[PDB]
Amino acid sequence: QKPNIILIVADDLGYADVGFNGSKDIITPNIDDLAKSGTSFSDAYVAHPFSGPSRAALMTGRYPHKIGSQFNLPTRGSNVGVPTDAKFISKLLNENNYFTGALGKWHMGDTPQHHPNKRGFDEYYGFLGGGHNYFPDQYQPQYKKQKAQGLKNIFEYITPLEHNGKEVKETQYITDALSREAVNFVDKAVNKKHPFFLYLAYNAPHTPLQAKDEDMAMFPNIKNKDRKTYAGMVYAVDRGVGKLVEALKKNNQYDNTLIVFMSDNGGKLSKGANNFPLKAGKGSTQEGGFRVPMLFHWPKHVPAGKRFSHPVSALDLYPTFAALAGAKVEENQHLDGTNMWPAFIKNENPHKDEPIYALRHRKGYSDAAIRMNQWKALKVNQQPWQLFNIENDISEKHDVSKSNKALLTDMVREMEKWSWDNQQPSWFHETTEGVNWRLDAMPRFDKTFKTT
Amino acid sequence: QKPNIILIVADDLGYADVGFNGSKDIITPNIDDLAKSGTSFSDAYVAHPFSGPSRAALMTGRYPHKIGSQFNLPTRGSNVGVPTDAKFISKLLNENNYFTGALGKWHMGDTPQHHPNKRGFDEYYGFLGGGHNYFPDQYQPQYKKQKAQGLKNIFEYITPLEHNGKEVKETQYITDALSREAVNFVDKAVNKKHPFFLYLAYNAPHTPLQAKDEDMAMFPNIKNKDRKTYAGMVYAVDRGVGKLVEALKKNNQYDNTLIVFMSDNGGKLSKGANNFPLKAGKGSTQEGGFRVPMLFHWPKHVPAGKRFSHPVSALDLYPTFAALAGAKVEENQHLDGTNMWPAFIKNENPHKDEPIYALRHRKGYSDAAIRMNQWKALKVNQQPWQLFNIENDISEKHDVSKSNKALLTDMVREMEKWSWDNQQPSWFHETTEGVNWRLDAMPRFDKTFKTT
Amino acid sequence: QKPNIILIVADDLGYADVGFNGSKDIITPNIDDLAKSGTSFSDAYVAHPFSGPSRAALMTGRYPHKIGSQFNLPTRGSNVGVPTDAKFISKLLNENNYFTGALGKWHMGDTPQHHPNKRGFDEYYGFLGGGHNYFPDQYQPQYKKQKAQGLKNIFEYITPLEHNGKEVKETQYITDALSREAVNFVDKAVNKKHPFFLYLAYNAPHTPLQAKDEDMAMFPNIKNKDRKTYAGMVYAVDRGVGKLVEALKKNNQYDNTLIVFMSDNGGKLSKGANNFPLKAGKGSTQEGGFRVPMLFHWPKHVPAGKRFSHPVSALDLYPTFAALAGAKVEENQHLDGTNMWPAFIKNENPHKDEPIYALRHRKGYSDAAIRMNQWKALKVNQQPWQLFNIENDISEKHDVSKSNKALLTDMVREMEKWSWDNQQPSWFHETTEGVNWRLDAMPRFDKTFKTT
Numbered sequence A, B, C: 001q002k003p004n005i006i007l008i009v010a011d012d013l014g015y016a017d018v019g020f021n022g023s024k025d026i027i028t029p030n031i032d033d034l035a036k037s038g039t040s041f042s043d044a045y046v047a048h049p050f051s052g053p054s055r056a057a058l059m060t061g062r063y064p065h066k067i068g069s070q071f072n073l074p075t076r077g078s079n080v081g082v083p084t085d086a087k088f089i090s091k092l093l094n095e096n097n098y099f100t101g102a103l104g105k106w107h108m109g110d111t112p113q114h115h116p117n118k119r120g121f122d123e124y125y126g127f128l129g130g131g132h133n134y135f136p137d138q139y140q141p142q143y144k145k146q147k148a149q150g151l152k153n154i155f156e157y158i159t160p161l162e163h164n165g166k167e168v169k170e171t172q173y174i175t176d177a178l179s180r181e182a183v184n185f186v187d188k189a190v191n192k193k194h195p196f197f198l199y200l201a202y203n204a205p206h207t208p209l210q211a212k213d214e215d216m217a218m219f220p221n222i223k224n225k226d227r228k229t230y231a232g233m234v235y236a237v238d239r240g241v242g243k244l245v246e247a248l249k250k251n252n253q254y255d256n257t258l259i260v261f262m263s264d265n266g267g268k269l270s271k272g273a274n275n276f277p278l279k280a281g282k283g284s285t286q287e288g289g290f291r292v293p294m295l296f297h298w299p300k301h302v303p304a305g306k307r308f309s310h311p312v313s314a315l316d317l318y319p320t321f322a323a324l325a326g327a328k329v330e331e332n333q334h335l336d337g338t339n340m341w342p343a344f345i346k347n348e349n350p351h352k353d354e355p356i357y358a359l360r361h362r363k364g365y366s367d368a369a370i371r372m373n374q375w376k377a378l379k380v381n382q383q384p385w386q387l388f389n390i391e392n393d394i395s396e397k398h399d400v401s402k403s404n405k406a407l408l409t410d411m412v413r414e415m416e417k418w419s420w421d422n423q424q425p426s427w428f429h430e431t432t433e434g435v436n437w438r439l440d441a442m443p444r445f446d447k448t449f450k451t452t
């Protein structure tokens, strides 16, 4: 039989905020179990250092730049989204006989054609925008008050959740709610001859910082208020993963299920997170912004107790899942990742002599990153290109560009070459951001790929 | 049997320039007959306050902004047009067994793929551009003189008319010519088992101001020269409508034919028109620019002698005609109107708690309008957003924004939300307009949707 | 039987640099033989005054502007190219039973979908970018040194040649190498029931100026160093044409083969060329930049010893070849040329009362050209539109605009009309060129089509 696949994605999870990736203060035993009896990844990179584009990339297998999705969708709502001509991994799997489910955060389009149920997800339970308030007792009264005033543009963090299009009245803390529905999904899946795919998109530990008192009580030694709340949010995810894991064991699903656990981007230091030993955090092209924790777990298939030290991209998940599912992939889909399993099993670099990119736009310029073999190229804050031996210098403290001029110049030029089929953005997260984009003649790649 | 449908569209007809919509000086008895034995609309809105985009919207059922058609086509000619992937209502009806005809003004593309005969019209007789000179005795000598000089770029107002692609030598005043062919069309239609659709696009009373002496003689009390000519132009349309009506009765078509009569946009005050009691006129986002006269007539179906006081959009005609014809509509067509018939028959607002928009671009900024229930939001002349209780204040004299800040802000934000899937314009009416568009980083929606 | 077709294209060949088009110093007897027993063209125009766009136009039959290909591809590499939805003439011919081959320079896209083997060429031997170093003994050591350093972005002029996707180690001077493979191609073609199409794209006499000592020895009277080298480069092409011609005769192919020989654009005066009697050279909208030498040769079909004096466009080759091959052409392909054979055989103007355009972009403005009947309109160097009787004034010395105001204005307005379906460029030859394009709000057609 072909394996079941679960992709679990935390939102704004810091590099050092789970036990298996070095957390000395937050405790995540159920997630750590999956690590201990599976393989974790010390060099795992998402395709963009924040949510919308990173998630677009997970589902499509393409850098968000190639499909006009370089920015988060408009915060106050919109009728646009990740283009429909890039087939989602869920759609492909559904076409090769998988029962498909998506839970929690979407952030890839509110309209009918961009909805999870038209991107190849049989079941969906969650909220369509960038995040959500965690307590129904807080958020449902506010929404009711505003809808009765006649307002149509309501902040999406307080709007109702939905199940396959129809609104619901959620009763639990959201992290637990999604965990409950993850159980319900795998339970529904037992009564089918088909294998299953589940995209579990937790909004924790993303703002707003809201945790159950019961979870926070587990971290009495954490004296900082925001960090303690953050910790409780993360522990709530861990309880969920443990609850899912039990349901999988109960159903004899555990053994033929590949579980991936990761973050969508780096942690935000001002909102409770820790990215040790990486520099900076969310949104940055420093390692802190797009290098994330990740583990695979699949008994008798994924090695137990290993730590894989070569680069892996979130882009690889698409063709990798497809190869494991026996689903055909077409050359016209323009996948930017690679099926990493053959290299993974031989403990070899799946991106041997090949770059992994990050390009994030700012006001009138762009920050960039390149990861190839031991090297990390970095363009940030309008400075000249720096270069790091990232294997010796994970914190990016020692720029060795002066003694590798030819190598750095080469990497940047390859990025310049790669840039040409990037589409103009189909939207921006705010109206003024698009106005400034047009005003500044963006992209200003003359600044971005100038060399020393 | 499914009903025949006639859509009659005057060009630049003022709000107060037909008898049934309050004209004290111009007399339109045959059009008034249709009103008296049918229902007129006091709150009827086109999708854009001038021709090309408004007509694009009629045919496609979509706001012109969504399909890159926010501007009139180049005045001196072009090889572009209303995109071919938006199925015209004529095409849909033709596919559900209707005999289709288009007469008069097109203004939606000169090229073969944009031609009426490829947009689902079996018969077409008219001129493809923005308007035409009215007297063949004046215009045919000028065209002949210029073609013999060897000139290829001839002002489209003097070029020959055509019938299904072949040129003709028209003998009558154009308003009468089109009326004659409207008779010919419905006559041709009797000898078929099919019902029929007719889009009669009069160019009257659009410039240039040219009328028959016989028509002007009917308005001896009109002392102003331009208004008298204008009046004669409008009376000529009325004669045409009466002539069509006779032919329909002669053929036992009258009783199972829905006739819609309306304008493409508001009247232009400097070229003879009157928009009483509305403010401003053609091209404005004030009511005068996009609120137009309209009547439905269909015996034993449309109430006789009524005046419907709730909002209706030209966008509604597409799905409304389709529902009456029993033609299926697909979610992928992205229709922006609603089938208004169910609400119409119950005398309810078909756009209850839903906005009707107008957005018209200017040099480096945009004017806008929102109509929802009793409210009219207005952005004009780079002023702050104003708000009107349009039911009490049709002339837009009393801005009540200060005492409804939350409501106004809400409406504007919904318009901001709606703006995101507007395409960049595929053309402009002049070369400099596109240059200025690019220079000004348009759209400048940061100005257009800023709130107080 | 339908005829074999060979299209031979020199790169940067000057107007006066072959014997049959007036060369007093360079000697080209084998090319001259084809002229003497065929027809040469005194008014032959490519679609754009430099390589990439001109070649795109040859293959697609469309002005490069219509398909976003107005510029040369990025010099340092890219993953974009001539769009795949414009069917190449090679593809059409392959679909109507032709054995297809492409040799030498491509300059129309490095990626798999843009590769010659996916644009309808069975065989390809050459280099994919803008040109190449001529001596393997010089270029192969440099490439080997750089590949061993680990560099991935290597100047394309020193990279290996390829044969149907696999790299090769070429042993000869490139002009001779391509000539040898042209022989190999026509030889392979004998053993097939099919006729054949061959696109022989010499990079000579394009930079860098490198010739065999043996060739240069034939021009001892040429005292200038660059001109002597240039001459040797051109003689090497002539040897190749003679070698191909022998192989064709050997195989009884000569008599039922249409050979076309031409340049991709005008000669560059600073790199050895001569465009007498034309003004300026490569890249200009003066005649020197896009009026090129051309001959047809096809015994008992093309008249022997004639000089055809009416305009012909490179755009005509597509439908002309197609008509001779009996291959159907569709209206949806939007071909911008005409099948010129019927007019050619009657010694009539195939573009009678129809313009041939050239539009080349510069820093914040564009130069333009129009050729119709005896007239040449010219916009250059930000000057006002000039007009020339090009039949009496081939060097463009006598502007007669003042006494033909109406005619000039007409031509320009038709060009303005033609401009509207030009696509925004899908790429530029350098990063800064695209930045400057966006900064300058290009195209600035308000400057380009302003009239007096």
Ligand SMILES: O=S(=O)(O)O[C@@H]1[C@H](O[C@H]2O[C@@H]3CO[C@@H]([C@H]3O[C@@H]3O[C@H](CO)[C@H](OS(=O)(=O)O)[C@H](O[C@H]4O[C@@H]5CO[C@@H]([C@H]5O)[C@H]4OS(=O)(=O)O)[C@H]3O)[C@H]2OS(=O)(=O)O)[C@@H](O)[C@H](O)O[C@@H]1CO
Residues within 6 Å of the ligand: A011, A012, A049, A050, A051, A052, A072, A129, A130, A131, A155, A206, A207, A208, A265, A268, A282, A283, A284, A429
């Ligand atoms: O008092 S509040 O609760 O703060 O007020 C509320 C609103 O403020 C909040 O709104 C969201 C939720 O929490 C904060 C803010 O976070 C933003 O959430 C986005 C997703 O919804 C997004 O995160 S992402 O999805 O992982 O990408 C935002 O990050 C992005 O922001 C920009 C767009 O892309 C990047 C930025 O350019 C990305 O961030 S990055 O650069 O670090 O990568 C994320 O910030 C909270 O706002 S706060 O400023 O952080 O405090 C408030 O707007 C409104 O007025 O009131 C509500 C009601 O409570």
Ligand SMILES: O=S(=O)(O)O[C@@H]1[C@H](O[C@H]2O[C@@H]3CO[C@@H]([C@H]3O[C@@H]3O[C@H](CO)[C@H](OS(=O)(=O)O)[C@H](O[C@H]4O[C@@H]5CO[C@@H]([C@H]5O)[C@H]4OS(=O)(=O)O)[C@H]3O)[C@H]2OS(=O)(=O)O)[C@@H](O)[C@H](O)O[C@@H]1CO
Residues within 6 Å of the ligand: A345, A346, A347, A348, A349
């Ligand atoms: O002709 S070659 O020069 O050999 O070709 C080259 C490359 O092929 C080689 O690639 C590596 C190095 O030598 C062979 C192959 O060995 C594998 O090396 C891995 C690291 O890159 C890894 O070694 S490890 O680091 O000690 O772990 C592999 O071992 C692991 O494999 C499984 C996963 O964990 C263990 C196994 O269960 C671990 O093995 S262990 O028991 O030793 O601990 C190791 O196999 C050689 O390839 S070949 O397979 O022998 O053919 C080629 O990939 C590259 O593209 O080109 C070069 C050209 O020089």
Ligand SMILES: O=S(=O)(O)O[C@@H]1[C@H](O[C@H]2O[C@@H]3CO[C@@H]([C@H]3O[C@@H]3O[C@H](CO)[C@H](OS(=O)(=O)O)[C@H](O[C@H]4O[C@@H]5CO[C@@H]([C@H]5O)[C@H]4OS(=O)(=O)O)[C@H]3O)[C@H]2OS(=O)(=O)O)[C@@H](O)[C@H](O)O[C@@H]1CO
Residues within 6 Å of the ligand: B011, B012, B049, B050, B051, B052, B072, B129, B130, B131, B155, B206, B207, B208, B268, B282, B283, B284, B429
């Ligand atoms: O003696 S003249 O008639 O003036 O000489 C001729 C030309 O002038 C005329 O050109 C047309 C016909 O009559 C006047 C002018 O009207 C324009 O017609 C357009 C359609 O072809 C269009 O109307 S529309 O279709 O209902 O929209 C024009 O309105 C638009 O204009 C701009 C583009 O979109 C809007 C504007 O931004 C829209 O108008 S709006 O802002 O009110 O909404 C309409 O003006 C007449 O010109 S005049 O200026 O009205 O006097 C002349 O230019 C030419 O050179 O020569 C001919 C022949 O002699």
Ligand SMILES: O=S(=O)(O)O[C@@H]1[C@H](O[C@H]2O[C@@H]3CO[C@@H]([C@H]3O[C@@H]3O[C@H](CO)[C@H](OS(=O)(=O)O)[C@H](O[C@H]4O[C@@H]5CO[C@@H]([C@H]5O)[C@H]4OS(=O)(=O)O)[C@H]3O)[C@H]2OS(=O)(=O)O)[C@@H](O)[C@H](O)O[C@@H]1CO
Residues within 6 Å of the ligand: C011, C012, C049, C050, C051, C052, C072, C129, C130, C131, C155, C206, C207, C208, C268, C282, C283, C284, C429
């Ligand atoms: O000087 S060298 O020692 O030779 O240095 C070398 C490199 O410089 C060279 O680079 C190329 C090859 O030879 C010269 C230059 O020629 C350019 O070739 C292009 C195609 O590869 C193109 O020709 S084209 O394809 O027929 O069009 C260039 O012309 C175009 O350039 C722009 C894009 O479109 C136009 C321009 O806007 C078009 O020119 S046009 O307007 O005249 O039509 C053509 O210039 C040589 O450069 S030089 O300036 O002549 O000296 C150097 O870059 C590299 O780093 O090293 C080698 C030496 O090892």
Ligand SMILES: O=S(=O)(O)O[C@@H]1[C@H](O[C@H]2O[C@@H]3CO[C@@H]([C@H]3O[C@@H]3O[C@H](CO)[C@H](OS(=O)(=O)O)[C@H](O[C@H]4O[C@@H]5CO[C@@H]([C@H]5O)[C@H]4OS(=O)(=O)O)[C@H]3O)[C@H]2OS(=O)(=O)O)[C@@H](O)[C@H](O)O[C@@H]1CO
Residues within 6 Å of the ligand: C361, C362, C363, C430, C432, C433, C436
């Ligand atoms: O003062 S001098 O004696 O003239 O100095 C000399 C050198 O400067 C000159 O170098 C060239 C020849 O004429 C000027 C300059 O032109 C530029 O050449 C570029 C490549 O060599 C390129 O030409 S192109 O490839 O044919 O296009 C430049 O054009 C491009 O620039 C932008 C990027 O793409 C386009 C632009 O957006 C393209 O322009 S285009 O679209 O119009 O094609 C072209 O400007 C001359 O420079 S000067 O300062 O203006 O005089 C000097 O560098 C050297 O050191 O010395 C010699 C004398 O010894």
Ligand SMILES: [Ca+2]
Residues within 6 Å of the ligand: A011, A012, A050, A051, A206, A264, A265
């Ligand atoms: Ca996030």
Ligand SMILES: [Ca+2]
Residues within 6 Å of the ligand: B011, B012, B050, B051, B206, B264, B265
């Ligand atoms: Ca009008």
Ligand SMILES: [Ca+2]
Residues within 6 Å of the ligand: C011, C012, C050, C051, C206, C264, C265
């Ligand atoms: Ca060239």
